[PDB]
Amino acid sequence: MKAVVPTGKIYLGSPFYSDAQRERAAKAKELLAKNPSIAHVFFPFDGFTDPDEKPEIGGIRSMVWRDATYQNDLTGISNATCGVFLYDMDQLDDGSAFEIGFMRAMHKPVILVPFTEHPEKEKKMNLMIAQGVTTIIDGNTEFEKLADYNFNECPSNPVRGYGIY
Amino acid sequence: MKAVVPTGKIYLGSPFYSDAQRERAAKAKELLAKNPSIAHVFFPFDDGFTDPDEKNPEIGGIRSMVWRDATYQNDLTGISNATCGVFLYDMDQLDDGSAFEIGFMRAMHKPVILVPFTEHPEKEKKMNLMIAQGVTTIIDGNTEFEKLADYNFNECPSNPVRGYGIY
Amino acid sequence: MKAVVPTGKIYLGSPFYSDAQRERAAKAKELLAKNPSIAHVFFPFDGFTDPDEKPEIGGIRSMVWRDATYQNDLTGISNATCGVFLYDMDQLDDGSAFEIGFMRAMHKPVILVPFTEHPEKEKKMNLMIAQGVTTIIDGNTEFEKLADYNFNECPSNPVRGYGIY
Amino acid sequence: MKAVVPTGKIYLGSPFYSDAQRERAAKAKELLAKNPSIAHVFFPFDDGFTDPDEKNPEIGGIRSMVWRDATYQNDLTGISNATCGVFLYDMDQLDDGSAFEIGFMRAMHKPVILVPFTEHPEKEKKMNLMIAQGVTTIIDGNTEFEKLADYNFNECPSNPVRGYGIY
Amino acid sequence: MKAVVPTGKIYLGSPFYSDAQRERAAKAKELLAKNPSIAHVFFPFDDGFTDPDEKNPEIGGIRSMVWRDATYQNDLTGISNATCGVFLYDMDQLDDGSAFEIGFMRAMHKPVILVPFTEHPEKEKKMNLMIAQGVTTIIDGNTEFEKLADYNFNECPSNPVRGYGIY
Amino acid sequence: MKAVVPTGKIYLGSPFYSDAQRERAAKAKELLAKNPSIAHVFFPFDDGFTDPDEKNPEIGGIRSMVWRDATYQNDLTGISNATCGVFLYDMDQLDDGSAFEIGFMRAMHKPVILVPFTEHPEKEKKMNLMIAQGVTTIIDGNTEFEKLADYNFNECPSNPVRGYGIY
Numbered sequence: 001m002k003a004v005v006p007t008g009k010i011y012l013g014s015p016f017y018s019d020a021q022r023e024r025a026a027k028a029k030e031l032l033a034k035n036p037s038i039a040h041v042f043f044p045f046d047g048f049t050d051p052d053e054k055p056e057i058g059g060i061r062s063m064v065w066r067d068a069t070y071q072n073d074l075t076g077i078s079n080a081t082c083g084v085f086l087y088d089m090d091q092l093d094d095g096s097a098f099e100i101g102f103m104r105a106m107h108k109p110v111i112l113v114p115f116t117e118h119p120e121k122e123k124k125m126n127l128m129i130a131q132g133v134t135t136i137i138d139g140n141t142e143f144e145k146l147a148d149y150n151f152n153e154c155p156s157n158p159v160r161g162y163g164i165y
Numbered sequence: 166m167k168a169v170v171p172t173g174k175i176y177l178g179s180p181f182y183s184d185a186q187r188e189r190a191a192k193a194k195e196l197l198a199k200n201p202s203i204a205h206v207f208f209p210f211d212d213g214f215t216d217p218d219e220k221n222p223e224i225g226g227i228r229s230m231v232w233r234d235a236t237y238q239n240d241l242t243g244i245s246n247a248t249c250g251v252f253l254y255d256m257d258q259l260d261d262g263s264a265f266e267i268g269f270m271r272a273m274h275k276p277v278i279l280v281p282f283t284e285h286p287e288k289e290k291k292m293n294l295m296i297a298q299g300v301t302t303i304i305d306g307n308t309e310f311e312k313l314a315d316y317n318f319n320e321c322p323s324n325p326v327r328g329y330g331i332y
Numbered sequence: 333m334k335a336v337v338p339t340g341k342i343y344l345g346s347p348f349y350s351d352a353q354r355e356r357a358a359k360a361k362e363l364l365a366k367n368p369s370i371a372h373v374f375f376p377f378d379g380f381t382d383p384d385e386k387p388e389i390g391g392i393r394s395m396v397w398r399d400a401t402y403q404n405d406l407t408g409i410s411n412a413t414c415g416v417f418l419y420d421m422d423q424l425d426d427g428s429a430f431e432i433g434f435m436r437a438m439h440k441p442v443i444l445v446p447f448t449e450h451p452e453k454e455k456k457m458n459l460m461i462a463q464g465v466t467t468i469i470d471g472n473t474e475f476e477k478l479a480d481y482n483f484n485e486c487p488s489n490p491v492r493g494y495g496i497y
Numbered sequence: 498m499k500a501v502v503p504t505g506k507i508y509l510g511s512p513f514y515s516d517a518q519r520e521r522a523a524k525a526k527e528l529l530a531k532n533p534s535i536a537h538v539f540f541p542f543d544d545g546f547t548d549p550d551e552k553n554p555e556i557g558g559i560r561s562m563v564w565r566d567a568t569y570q571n572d573l574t575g576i577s578n579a580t581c582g583v584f585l586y587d588m589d590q591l592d593d594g595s596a597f598e599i600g601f602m603r604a605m606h607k608p609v610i611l612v613p614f615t616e617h618p619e620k621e622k623k624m625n626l627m628i629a630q631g632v633t634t635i636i637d638g639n640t641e642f643e644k645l646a647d648y649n650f651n652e653c654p655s656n657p658v659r660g661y662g663i664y
Numbered sequence: 665m666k667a668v669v670p671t672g673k674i675y676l677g678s679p680f681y682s683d684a685q686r687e688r689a690a691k692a693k694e695l696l697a698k699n700p701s702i703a704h705v706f707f708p709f710d711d712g713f714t715d716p717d718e719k720n721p722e723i724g725g726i727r728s729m730v731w732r733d734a735t736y737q738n739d740l741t742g743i744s745n746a747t748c749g750v751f752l753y754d755m756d757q758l759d760d761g762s763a764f765e766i767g768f769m770r771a772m773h774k775p776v777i778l779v780p781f782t783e784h785p786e787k788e789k790k791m792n793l794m795i796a797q798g799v800t801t802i803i804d805g806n807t808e809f810e811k812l813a814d815y816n817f818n819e820c821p822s823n824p825v826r827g828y829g830i831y
Numbered sequence: 832m833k834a835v836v837p838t839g840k841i842y843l844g845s846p847f848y849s850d851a852q853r854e855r856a857a858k859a860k861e862l863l864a865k866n867p868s869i870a871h872v873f874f875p876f877d878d879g880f881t882d883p884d885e886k887n888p889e890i891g892g893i894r895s896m897v898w899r900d901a902t903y904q905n906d907l908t909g910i911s912n913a914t915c916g917v918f919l920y921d922m923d924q925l926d927d928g929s930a931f932e933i934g935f936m937r938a939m940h941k942p943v944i945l946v947p948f949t950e951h952p953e954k955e956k957k958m959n960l961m962i963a964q965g966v967t968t969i970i971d972g973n974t975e976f977e978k979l980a981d982y983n984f985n986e987c988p989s990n991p992v993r994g995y996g997i998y
């Protein structure tokens with residue numbers, strides 16, 4: 001069971017708007033970078049340039065750019081052995097959720113690293129995410145577990161203690 | 166070409182509970198029921214699984230793993246049987262459950278019809294790239310909702326998302 | 333949710349050696365034949381002839397026959413919307429199990445109809461089958477449920493009360 | 498066993514050049530129309546998407562990315578909805594689009610009926626390994642075209658390719 | 665061609681508990697550990713999931729749905745990560761768990777190496793068609809078990825099952 | 832981001848005829864060998880299965896079903912093990928085997944690098960829709976062949992086909 005070489009190929013999915021989300025991603029990268037079970041980590045926001053767009057994030061983008069960028073992400077999922085999603089429970093990212101469903105449809109494991117800045121609200125989760133994810137590591141209290149998690153086999157850890165939406 | 170018998174099997178995805186959202190689903194059903202190209206429609210919230218071993222089933226509480234598995238699988242089964250997905254997509258309150266299955270359906274190479282709804286037309290028209298590119302056909306819920314009754318679900322002609330800022 | 337036309341396309345998997353197994357299959361067919369939610373039922377033992385085999389069941393078969401026959405079965409699984417397996421708990425059929433795993437890998441629903449002529453033995457099941465199957469209908473006490481089951485949506489019914497092997 | 502209703506959903510793949518190719522396609526449709534096992538038939542060249550931004554569109558000419566995506570997806574949607582593929586395979590001028598589709602369908606584990614055509618029945622009979630082993634059923638177009646009218650698409654009985662040299 | 669680094673990721677499937685079966689798995693590990701083409705080996709029975717909410721975990725009893733889900737998924741995850749499967753197949757006592765994953769792996773188009781074992785060589789040599797055809801490479805456990813240390817898992821060359829009666 | 836170890840597993844598809852084709856294949860291997868991102872490279876024509884029952888086997892001649900299955904499966908196994916495909920695509924004589932493989936890989940959602948070659952750089956630039964939209968990255972073989980030595984196969988950056996008429 002002991003890998004002769006790292007085989008964990010990570011698809012790090014995550015929103016990239018607010019500074020918080022930006023901070024989590026930069027850290028998650030630092031953590032995963034210490035994990036000996038990882039061989040490669042892909043982060044989609046690290047892009048394609050359409051020599052025809054005379055372009056802004058959030059603006060109207062060319063179809064060529066859209067296709068190339070969306071494909072770069074699907075390619076990342078294809079090459080990956082598992083997904084790690086810095087999941088924002090406050091501002092739900094539909095892009096991230098899409099990717100989770102896509103990865104599960106491909107039968108790949110998905111580690112959910114939820115984050116919330118509202119401890120007051122009863123921890124609730126949509127069924128699809130709750131039953132779709134294979135392993136959960138609380139981002140607010142276990143973010144560091146990512147540096148040790150064995151990605152060569154991705155041990156399961158069902159979602160529990162969450163009210164199913 | 167013209168089908169000999171209805172071939173469309175719809176997986177109707179949509180957020181629920183919310184008053185407006187329930188309204189949409191209800192209207193979506195009526196519209197689909199009028200489509201001659203549809204053989205079957207599956208809506209996840211209709212019937213449910215009852216875990217006789219569940220004391221006071223909290224429709225938002227913890228809920229047993231037995232009910233979770235059985236309910237989740239009923240959804241994957243609907244996706245499996247469907248020929249296409251029709252999603253009543255709320256642009257104001259993004260539903261990750263809906264997004265999950267869109268990606269799940271696209272991974273299976275099945276067509277997905279996105280029906281966006283927004284109560285704030287004055288607000289920015291922006292969509293996540295994965296949704297904008299993942300979807301194969303868009304039908305504005307606020308303006309073309311009625312097209313669901315005429316749309317040919319035997320072939321699901323595509324209609325790329327356009328006119329939305331992308332992030 | 334009410335189908336305008338039947339959409340249930342059944343892949344009826346089952347051993348076909350003993351007379352018992354042969355009896356169950358003939359009955360399962362009769363039952364399913366009464367179900368209004370079924371549009372078609374495929375039973376693999378209903379074959380290909382290789383005009384080159386100068387052949388016996390259990391004997392050495394030509395590769396052409398093997399390929400054509402195996403494919404006829406995969407084609408049946410491809411066309412099917414769900415599988416119904418007359419599962420023998422006494423004499424485990426690896427062919428049937430293979431097909432269950434194949435169908436689940438394709439995310440299709442699988443109805444397990446177990447049979448046993450040894451009520452004395454503690455009901456035990458292999459994990460993969462127990463967690464792989466989506467719906468179970470006891471063959472010894474609910475065989476008739478197949479005539480009523482709604483195959484247009486295949487309601488879930490997790491396996492319970494079985495010792496996991 | 499006997500089907501209560503037609504369940505065959507055919508993806509009719511085919512080059513759409515030379516008068517010979519479009520004529521075979523024509524005949525293919527006629528034959529399929531008379532088959533009681535067929536529920537629906539999709540021919541990629543029958544409809545077509547129209548991109549308003551695209552001016553003076555021409556076949557073989559530079560096309561917009563939007564038109565390309567929509568059209569490609571329409572073909573994949575057809576493959577997804579199909580229960581089996583029927584390819585009018587031109588053995589004289591190999592068509593990579595059809596071959597791409599045969600491979601895509603086999604990856605999805607769907608049956609593929611190959612219907613080869615040659616204007617030179619006397620030249621050597623050779624076939625690429627992937628096509629020869631990828632297809633599940635072969636029906637010669639030059640002498641058995643007509644059985645598309647009777648073939649049982651509810652079950653698609655296999656019939657391995659034999660008699661062709663392999664390269 | 666020659667790999668720059670081990671690429672083989674094995675999913676070692678096999679029945680357990682039985683004295684002889686445990687022996688095989690143990691020997692299989694040793695043999696694989698000596699293969700230069702292997703980067704990783706996953707054996708389902710090694711480590712396990714503990715459900716802190718499980719009183720007296722009966723290794724054959726009912727067992728919680730939480731443990732079942734988590735354990736089953738650990739297996740599907742091993743199949744997902746693997747590049748190929750190596751199954752210590754007991755021909756005397758057929759293991760449906762092993763058969764399930766063989767089919768699951770073949771549906772994913774992954775290569776499967778079958779390693780049959782029998783304590784009754786005097787008995788009929790027969791194999792189920794699905795196994796005989798589903799498998800891509802066979803290595804007799806009773807006579808070539810040692811080949812597991814030389815086999816190139818970077819390319820998994822096929823070796824069709826032959827010499828077995830088929831039912 | 833930077834990979835700890837090479838993770839690119841290439842499926843090198845290519846016709847294996849004319850001296851030109853086998854020479855490109857030769858060069859392709861040389862270039863790939865010098866790419867630090869490549870862990871392994873599979874070329875379908877490098878090894879080969881041998882069927883003892885088969886006597887006087889010849890290329891293009893009638894082959895045994897056992898040889899056909901083994902060889903076809905060896906190619907599918909290669910596609911399964913591969914993280915991406917690289918096709919030395921002959922634009923002058925279309926090869927259905929390569930096209931079949933491109934489609935099979937795209938159905939599995941794997942990236943496909945197309946490397947087109949033409950001995951007539953002046954003739955019209957036209958490509959079949961499925962190939963043009965199916966591939967994720969194009970690298971001209973006639974003027975950019977050499978970048979196979981530097982392309983980042985750990986991530987395979989997309990590069991849509993443009994400049995080709997579509998038919």
Ligand SMILES: OC[C@H]1O[C@@H](n2cnc3c(=[Se])[nH]cnc32)[C@H](O)[C@@H]1O
Nearest residue numbers: 013014015044073093095096294332
């Ligand atoms: O919501 C974030 C997720 O969706 C994808 N994504 C959304 N917008 C993107 C731009 Se602009 N560029 C690259 N990838 C992008 C990512 O996979 C990320 O996981």
Ligand SMILES: OC[C@H]1O[C@@H](n2cnc3c(=[Se])[nH]cnc32)[C@H](O)[C@@H]1O
Nearest residue numbers: 126127165178179180209240262263
């Ligand atoms: O298949 C996913 C669909 O299932 C619906 N759904 C079914 N039961 C659910 C409970 Se309880 N909680 C949250 N979502 C639930 C989602 O709206 C999604 O469209």
Ligand SMILES: OC[C@H]1O[C@@H](n2cnc3c(=[Se])[nH]cnc32)[C@H](O)[C@@H]1O
Nearest residue numbers: 345346347376405425427428793831
């Ligand atoms: O074990 C029985 C299962 O395996 C397949 N099968 C095994 N031997 C077969 C012969 Se001979 N002919 C046709 N199908 C056959 C069936 O799919 C059946 O479900």
Ligand SMILES: OC[C@H]1O[C@@H](n2cnc3c(=[Se])[nH]cnc32)[C@H](O)[C@@H]1O
Nearest residue numbers: 458459497677678679708739761762
């Ligand atoms: O992935 C399927 C493999 O899992 C093993 N397995 C893991 N835990 C199991 C319990 Se508890 N019971 C029965 N089988 C079990 C099977 O041998 C099969 O190879």
Ligand SMILES: OC[C@H]1O[C@@H](n2cnc3c(=[Se])[nH]cnc32)[C@H](O)[C@@H]1O
Nearest residue numbers: 510511512541568572594595960998
């Ligand atoms: O090359 C033959 C196959 O490929 C597809 N195809 C190639 N170019 C196309 C245009 Se322009 N429009 C729609 N479909 C097209 C067809 O599906 C056909 O089977």
Ligand SMILES: OC[C@H]1O[C@@H](n2cnc3c(=[Se])[nH]cnc32)[C@H](O)[C@@H]1O
Nearest residue numbers: 626664844845846875902906928929
């Ligand atoms: O036609 C080009 C492609 O198809 C395959 N192929 C066709 N005939 C073959 C014989 Se004979 N042996 C091994 N592979 C073979 C190759 O994978 C190549 O990419």
